[PDB]
Amino acid sequence: SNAAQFKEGEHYQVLKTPASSSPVVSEFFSFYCPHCNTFEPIIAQLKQQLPEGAKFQKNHVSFMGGNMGQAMSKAYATMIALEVEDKMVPVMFNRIHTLRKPPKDEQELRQIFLDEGIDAAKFDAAYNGFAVDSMVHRFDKQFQDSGLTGVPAVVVNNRYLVQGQSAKSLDEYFDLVNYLLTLK
């Protein structure tokens, strides 16, 4: 017998973007998105069970938060640049969704980092710097080129968009991502 396989059109969609050069799982998210917050424990599990060699990369989108969406994307890229994601990702989700005190402007956004002990000079150099600017350009262009319509969204190898609702269980969802990682 031959085993059943995941199906294009039911379980995933092939996007117009080029395939990646190595295996990668990308999650498009916003800190403003409650469901993205809810998805965090599942993302942690997903990462822990990925095949050796596969990368995982969050991409922040700028379309939630009104006039603070771009600033919040810069904040996420700053977390990457400063290598403080493990602390600052849950801090930022907590600030928005549990404390429910989202930053009204870039000054308040910066203060969220300083209040966790992030060095002010390092923050200022990163937030307004070239690496962060480059990363936010990439987040936005990837979202556009991929033709995505909302968050959260999980894309494997740059061109396989997971149809999240198609999986009947978490283990099946993981199986789907692991399968897509083998496709070019």
From Swiss-Prot:
Localization per record: Periplasm
InterPro entries associated with the record: DSBA-like_thioredoxin_dom (IPR001853), DsbA/DsbL (IPR023205), Thiol_disulfide_DsbA (IPR050824), Thioredoxin-like_sf (IPR036249), Thioredoxin_domain (IPR013766)
Pfam family, one: DSBA
Keyword Transmembrane helix: no
Gene3D superfamilies (UniProt xref): Glutaredoxin
Any Gene Ontology CC annotation: outer membrane-bounded periplasmic space
Keyword Transmembrane belongs to the record: no
GO terms of biological process kind: cellular response to antibiotic
Similarity section: Belongs to the thioredoxin family. DsbA subfamily.
Protein purpose: Involved in disulfide-bond formation. Required for the functional maturation of secreted virulence factors. Acts by transferring its disulfide bond to other proteins.
The protein's name: Thiol:disulfide interchange protein DsbA
Species of the source: Vibrio cholerae serotype O1 (strain ATCC 39315 / El Tor Inaba N16961)
Phylogenetic placement of the source organism: Bacteria, Pseudomonadati, Pseudomonadota, Gammaproteobacteria, Vibrionales
Gene, per the UniProt record: dsbA
